[PDB]
Amino acid sequence: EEEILEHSGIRLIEPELFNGYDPKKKQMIQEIVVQHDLEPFECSKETAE
Amino acid sequence: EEEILEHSGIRLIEPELFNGYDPKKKQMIQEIVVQHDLEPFECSKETAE
């Protein structure tokens, strides 16, 4: 009973039910211009191209 | 006449009509793990947090 009521109805968003979506940790990306060039990394022919 | 026919109908995708969308230069992003940490960059309080 306790767990049914705890995990049914209106409740805190569970990241396990939405592919790890944590509203507290809403993930985004910011555009930054590299000021100092980065060290090389290795990837395949198509990726480098 | 020539410009109407050139820029009407089925034609090469014009990036100016689709917010700079160039099919020849389809932009994507790849996840990379930093192997050597980058040099500092400056941003605001909320951005750093």
Q: Which helix (H) or strand (E) holds B48?
A: helix B45-48
Instruction: Report the candidate in A41, A28, A26, A25 with the shortest Cα–Cα distance to residue B37.
Output: A41
Chain centre to alpha carbon of residue A10: 23
Residues 6+ apart with CB under 8 A from B15: B21, B22
Chain centre to alpha carbon of residue A15: 10
Got the DSSP string for A6-27?
Answer: HTSSS-PPPGGGTTT--GGG--
**Both tokens of residue A30?**
């910011």
Q: Which chain A residues are Cβ-neighbours of B32 within 8 angstroms?
A: 41
Provide the resolution (angstroms): 2.6
Q: Which helix (H) or strand (E) holds A4?
A: helix A2-6
Q: Which chain B residues are Cβ-neighbours of A30 within 8 angstroms?
A: 43, 47
DSSP A34: -
Q: Do B39 and A41 touch (CB under 8 A)?
A: no
- Which of B34, B35, B39 comes nearest A35 by C-beta? B39
The Cα–Cα gap between B40 and B23 comes to: 34
